[PDB]
Short mmCIF file of C-alpha atoms and ligand atoms in Angstrom, two decimals:
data_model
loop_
_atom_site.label_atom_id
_atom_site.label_comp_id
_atom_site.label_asym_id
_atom_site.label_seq_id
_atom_site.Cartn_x
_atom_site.Cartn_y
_atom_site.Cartn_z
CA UNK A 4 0.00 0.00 0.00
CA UNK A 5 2.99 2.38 0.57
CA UNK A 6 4.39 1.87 -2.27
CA UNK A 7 1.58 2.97 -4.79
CA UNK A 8 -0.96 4.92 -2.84
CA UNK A 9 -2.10 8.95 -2.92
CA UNK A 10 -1.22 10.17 0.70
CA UNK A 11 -4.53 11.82 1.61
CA UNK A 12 -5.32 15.18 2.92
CA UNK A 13 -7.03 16.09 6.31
CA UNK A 14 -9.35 18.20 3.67
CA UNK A 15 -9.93 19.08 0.21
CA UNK A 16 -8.96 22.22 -1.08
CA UNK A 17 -10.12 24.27 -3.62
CA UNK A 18 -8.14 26.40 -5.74
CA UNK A 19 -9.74 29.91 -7.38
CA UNK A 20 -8.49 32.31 -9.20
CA UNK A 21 -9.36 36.14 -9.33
CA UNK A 22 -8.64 38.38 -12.47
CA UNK A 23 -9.96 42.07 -12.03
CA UNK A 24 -12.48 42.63 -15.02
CA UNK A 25 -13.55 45.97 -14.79
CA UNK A 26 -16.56 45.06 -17.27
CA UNK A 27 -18.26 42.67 -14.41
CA UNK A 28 -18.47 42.41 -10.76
CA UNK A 29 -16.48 41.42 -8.54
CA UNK A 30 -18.13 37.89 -8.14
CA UNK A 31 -18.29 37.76 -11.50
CA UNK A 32 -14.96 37.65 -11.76
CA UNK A 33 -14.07 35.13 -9.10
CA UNK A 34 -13.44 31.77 -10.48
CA UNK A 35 -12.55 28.05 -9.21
CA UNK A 36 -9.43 26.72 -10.62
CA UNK A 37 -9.36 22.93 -9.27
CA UNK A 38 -9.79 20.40 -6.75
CA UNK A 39 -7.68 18.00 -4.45
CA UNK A 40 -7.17 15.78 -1.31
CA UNK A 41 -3.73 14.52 -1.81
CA UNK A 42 -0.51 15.47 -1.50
CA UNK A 43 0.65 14.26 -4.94
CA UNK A 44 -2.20 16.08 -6.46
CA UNK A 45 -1.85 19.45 -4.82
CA UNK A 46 1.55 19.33 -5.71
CA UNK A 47 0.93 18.79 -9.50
CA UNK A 48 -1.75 21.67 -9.25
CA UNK A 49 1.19 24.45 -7.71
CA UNK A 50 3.82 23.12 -10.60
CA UNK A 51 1.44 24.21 -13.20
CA UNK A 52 0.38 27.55 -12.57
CA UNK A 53 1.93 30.59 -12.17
CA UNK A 54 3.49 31.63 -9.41
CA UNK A 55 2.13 34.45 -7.36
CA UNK A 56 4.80 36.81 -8.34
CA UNK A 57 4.11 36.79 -11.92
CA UNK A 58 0.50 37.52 -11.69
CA UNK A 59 -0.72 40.82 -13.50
CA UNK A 60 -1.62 43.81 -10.67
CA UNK A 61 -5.84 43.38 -9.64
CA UNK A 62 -5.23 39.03 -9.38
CA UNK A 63 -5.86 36.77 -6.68
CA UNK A 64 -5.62 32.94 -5.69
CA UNK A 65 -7.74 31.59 -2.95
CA UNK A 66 -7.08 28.21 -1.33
CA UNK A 67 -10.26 27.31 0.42
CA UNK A 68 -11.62 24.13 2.27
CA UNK A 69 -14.00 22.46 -0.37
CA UNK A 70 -17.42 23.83 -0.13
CA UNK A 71 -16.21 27.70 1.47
CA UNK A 72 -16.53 30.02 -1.03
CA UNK A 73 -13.56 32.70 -0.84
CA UNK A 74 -15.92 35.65 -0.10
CA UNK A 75 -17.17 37.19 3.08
CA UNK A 76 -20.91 36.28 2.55
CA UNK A 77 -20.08 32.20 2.88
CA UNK A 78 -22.16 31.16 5.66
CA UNK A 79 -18.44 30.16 7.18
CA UNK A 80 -16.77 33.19 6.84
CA UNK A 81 -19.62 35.78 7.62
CA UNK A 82 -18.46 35.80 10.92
CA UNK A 83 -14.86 35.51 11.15
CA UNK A 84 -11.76 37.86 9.92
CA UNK A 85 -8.39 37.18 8.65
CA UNK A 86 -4.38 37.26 9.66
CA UNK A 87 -3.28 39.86 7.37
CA UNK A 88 0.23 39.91 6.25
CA UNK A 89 1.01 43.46 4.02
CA UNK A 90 3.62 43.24 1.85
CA UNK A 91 6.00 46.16 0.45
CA UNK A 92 6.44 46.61 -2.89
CA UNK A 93 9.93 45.44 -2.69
CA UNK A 94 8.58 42.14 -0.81
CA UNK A 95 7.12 41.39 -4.36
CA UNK A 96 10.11 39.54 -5.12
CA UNK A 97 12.04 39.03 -1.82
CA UNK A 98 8.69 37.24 0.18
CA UNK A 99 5.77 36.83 -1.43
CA UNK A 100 6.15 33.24 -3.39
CA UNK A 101 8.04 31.73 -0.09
CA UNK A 102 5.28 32.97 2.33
CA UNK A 103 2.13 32.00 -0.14
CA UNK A 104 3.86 28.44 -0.44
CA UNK A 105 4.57 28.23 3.32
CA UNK A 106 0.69 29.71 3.90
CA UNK A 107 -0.51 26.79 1.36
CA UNK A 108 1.61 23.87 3.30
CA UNK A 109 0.02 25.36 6.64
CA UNK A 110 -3.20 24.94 5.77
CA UNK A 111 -3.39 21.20 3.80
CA UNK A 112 -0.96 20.19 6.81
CA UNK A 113 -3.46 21.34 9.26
CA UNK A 114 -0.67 23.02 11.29
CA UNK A 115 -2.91 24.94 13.61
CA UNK A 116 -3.00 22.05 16.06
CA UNK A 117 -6.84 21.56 17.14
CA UNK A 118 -7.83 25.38 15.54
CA UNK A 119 -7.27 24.09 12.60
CA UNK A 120 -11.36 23.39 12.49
CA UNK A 121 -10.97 27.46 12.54
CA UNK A 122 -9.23 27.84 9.49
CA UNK A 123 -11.71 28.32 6.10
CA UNK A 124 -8.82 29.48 3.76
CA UNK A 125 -6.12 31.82 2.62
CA UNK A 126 -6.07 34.90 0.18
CA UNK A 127 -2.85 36.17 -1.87
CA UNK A 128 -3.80 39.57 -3.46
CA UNK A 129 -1.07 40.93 -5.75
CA UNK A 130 -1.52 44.75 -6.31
CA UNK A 131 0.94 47.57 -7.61
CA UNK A 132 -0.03 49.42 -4.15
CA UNK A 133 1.48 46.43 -2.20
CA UNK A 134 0.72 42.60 -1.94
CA UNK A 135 -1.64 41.05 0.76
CA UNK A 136 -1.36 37.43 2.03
CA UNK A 137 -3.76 36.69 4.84
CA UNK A 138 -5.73 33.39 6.63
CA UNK A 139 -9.51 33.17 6.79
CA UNK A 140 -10.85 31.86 10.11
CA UNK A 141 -14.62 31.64 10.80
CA UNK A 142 -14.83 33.23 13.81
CA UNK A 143 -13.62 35.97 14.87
CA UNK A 144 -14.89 36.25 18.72
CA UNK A 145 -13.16 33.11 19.40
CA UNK A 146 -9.77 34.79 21.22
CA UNK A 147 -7.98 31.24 21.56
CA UNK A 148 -8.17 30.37 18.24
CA UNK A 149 -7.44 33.39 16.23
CA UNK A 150 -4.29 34.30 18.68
CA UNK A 151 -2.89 30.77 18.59
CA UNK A 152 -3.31 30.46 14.71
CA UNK A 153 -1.54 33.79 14.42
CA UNK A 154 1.23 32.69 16.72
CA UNK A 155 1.66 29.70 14.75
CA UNK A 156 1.63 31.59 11.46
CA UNK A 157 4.01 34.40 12.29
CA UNK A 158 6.41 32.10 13.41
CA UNK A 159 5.81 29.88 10.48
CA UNK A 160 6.69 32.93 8.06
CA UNK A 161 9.58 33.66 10.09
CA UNK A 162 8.79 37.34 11.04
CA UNK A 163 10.64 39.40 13.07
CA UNK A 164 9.57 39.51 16.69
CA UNK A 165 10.52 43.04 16.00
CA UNK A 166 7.25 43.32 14.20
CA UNK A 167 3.20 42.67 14.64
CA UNK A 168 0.39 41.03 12.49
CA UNK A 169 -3.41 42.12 13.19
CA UNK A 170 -6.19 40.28 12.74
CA UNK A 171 -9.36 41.96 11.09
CA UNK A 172 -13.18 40.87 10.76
CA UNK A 173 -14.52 40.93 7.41
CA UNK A 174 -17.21 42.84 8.83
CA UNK A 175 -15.06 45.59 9.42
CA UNK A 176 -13.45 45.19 6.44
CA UNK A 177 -16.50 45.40 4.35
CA UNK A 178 -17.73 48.76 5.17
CA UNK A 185 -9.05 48.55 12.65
CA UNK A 186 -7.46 45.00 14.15
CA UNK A 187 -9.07 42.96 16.74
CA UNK A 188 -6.15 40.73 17.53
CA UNK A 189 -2.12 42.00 17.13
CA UNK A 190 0.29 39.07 17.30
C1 WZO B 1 -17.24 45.42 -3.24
O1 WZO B 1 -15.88 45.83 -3.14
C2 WZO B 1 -15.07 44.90 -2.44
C3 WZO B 1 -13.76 45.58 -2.15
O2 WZO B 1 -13.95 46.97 -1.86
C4 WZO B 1 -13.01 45.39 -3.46
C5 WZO B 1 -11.52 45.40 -3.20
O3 WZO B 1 -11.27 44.29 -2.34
P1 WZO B 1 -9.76 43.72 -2.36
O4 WZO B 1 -9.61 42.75 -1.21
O5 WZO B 1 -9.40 43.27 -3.75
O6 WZO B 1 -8.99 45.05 -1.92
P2 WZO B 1 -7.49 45.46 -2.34
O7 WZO B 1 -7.40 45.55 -3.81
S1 WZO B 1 -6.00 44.20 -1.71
O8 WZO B 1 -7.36 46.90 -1.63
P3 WZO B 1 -8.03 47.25 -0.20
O9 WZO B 1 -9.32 47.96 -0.55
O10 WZO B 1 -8.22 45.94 0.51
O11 WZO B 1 -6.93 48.22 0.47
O12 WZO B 1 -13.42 44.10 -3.93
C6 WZO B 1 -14.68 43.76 -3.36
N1 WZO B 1 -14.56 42.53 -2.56
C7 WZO B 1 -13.44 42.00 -1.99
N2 WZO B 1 -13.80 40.86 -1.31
C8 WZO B 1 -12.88 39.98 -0.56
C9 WZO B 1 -15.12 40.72 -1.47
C10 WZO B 1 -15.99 39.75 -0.99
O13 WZO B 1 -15.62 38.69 -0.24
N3 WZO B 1 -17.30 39.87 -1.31
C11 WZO B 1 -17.76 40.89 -2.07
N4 WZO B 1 -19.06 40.95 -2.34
N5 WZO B 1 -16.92 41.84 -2.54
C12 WZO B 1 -15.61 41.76 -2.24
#
């Protein structure tokens, strides 16, 4: 068995892709890329597309936990917020690829110990004003599990102590940081 068998994912992920269109809305323009629960298979889906870096400015990729949709008004993500990680323009090329990849192997490695269950998905926006990786969790009044996800992940990135993540709720976000880290 071993020696010819998938190794499974915890979940499966879904993959979407976001090209800014100005001719139709912004759902409209949200679209899902793939599927997979394996290891073998998620890595065949990152070798073929593009990394992050050489996106054009207004794209995103969502990795999501099959059957969240990436957008605030999923019934999972109505009430939660994300980790935010802003990056420079310079960070473009020095950090964005290595901390989307690490972002993607902490969430299909469930590395958010028993919060994991928290975690709905992770954004990467790339934008001439400055890229934007950040974690979806579902809730964000639960204080244990969005400050030991964001302990995990800042350490997991390898950021400076010298420095502090927030955590936001969509709801804010949709018309200020709940959680620092
Ligand atoms: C309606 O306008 C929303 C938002 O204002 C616009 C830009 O979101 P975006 O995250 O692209 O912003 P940035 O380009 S990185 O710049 P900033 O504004 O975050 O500093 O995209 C829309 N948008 C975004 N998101 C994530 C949703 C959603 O989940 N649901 C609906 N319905 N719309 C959404």
């Amino acid at each position: 068995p071993e020696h010819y068998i998938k190794h499974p994912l915890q979940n499966r992920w879904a993959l979407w892709f976001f090209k800014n269109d100005k001719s139709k809305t912004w759902q409209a323009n949200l679209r899902l890329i793939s599927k997979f629960d394996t290891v073998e298979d998620f890595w065949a889906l990152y070798n073929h597309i593009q990394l992050s870096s050489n996106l054009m400015p207004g794209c995103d990729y969502s990795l999501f936990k099959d059957g969240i949709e990436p957008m605030w008004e999923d019934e999972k993500n109505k009430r939660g917020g994300r980790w935010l990680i802003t990056l420079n323009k310079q960070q473009r090329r020095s950090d964005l690829d290595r901390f989307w990849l690490e972002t993607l192997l902490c969430l299909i490695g469930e590395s958010f110990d028993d919060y994991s269950d928290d975690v709905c998905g992770a954004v990467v926006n790339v934008r001439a004003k400055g890229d934007k990786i950040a974690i979806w969790t579902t809730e964000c009044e639960n204080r244990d599990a969005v400050t030991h996800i964001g302990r995990v992940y800042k350490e997991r990135l390898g950021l400076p102590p010298k420095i502090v993540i927030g955590y936001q709720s969509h709801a804010d976000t949709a018309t200020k940081n709940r959680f620092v880290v």
